[PDB]
Design a protein around this ligand. Structure first.
Ligand code: HEM
Ligand code: HEM
Ligand code: HEM
Length: 68
């Protein structure tokens, strides 16, 4: 898994749970190959991560559901 560090509690990101989303890899990455995400941080996460969870009605939307 990927551990996205945060001073209020790290967030654990699992690619397995994120297969079969619109755009597939390009939902989060510039390319189909993937890689590190230079823009990663609070602004990125609270837009893109939370945004999709709300759009799909699936996944964590409250602070402590991500930050542990
Ligand atoms: C099958 C499609 C995908 C591929 C091939 C892919 C590929 C990759 C690769 C190669 C890495 C870099 C791992 C490393 O260097 O340690 C990565 C990291 C990551 N991916 Fe994906 N990924 C895919 C889908 C997704 C999706 C859909 C999301 C969002 C929902 C996502 C979010 C992330 C995040 C947050 C990281 C960590 C980035 C960082 O720490 O800078 N990935 N992915
Ligand atoms: C209102 C509720 C939330 C609060 C108060 C909150 C607070 C924060 C704070 C203070 C940071 C910056 C941490 C740092 O730089 O050390 C951050 C970043 C982040 N948050 Fe949240 N957050 C909330 C909701 C969420 C949710 C629901 C998610 C998951 C969908 C999430 C995922 C993340 C991620 C992935 C980062 C970036 C970590 C990194 O790039 O290393 N947060 N958040
Ligand atoms: C880096 C950004 C993201 C983070 C940190 C994140 C985090 C998470 C976490 C922690 C879960 C599982 C919650 C649990 O097991 O308690 C989850 C589930 C889910 N996320 Fe994300 N997510 C991100 C981006 C996205 C995006 C962009 C999408 C849609 C395009 C998405 C769609 C989903 C879906 C559909 C689930 C439910 C999967 C299932 O139960 O099979 N997520 N996410």
């Amino acid at each position: 898994v990927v551990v996205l560090e945060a001073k209020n509690g790290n967030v654990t990101f699992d690619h397995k749970k994120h297969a079969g989303v619109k755009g597939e890899c390009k939902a989060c990455h510039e390319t189909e190959a993937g890689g590190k995400i230079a823009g990663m941080g609070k602004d990125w996460a609270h837009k893109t991560c939370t945004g999709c969870h709300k759009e799909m009605g699936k996944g964590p939307t409250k602070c402590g559901e991500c930050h542990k």
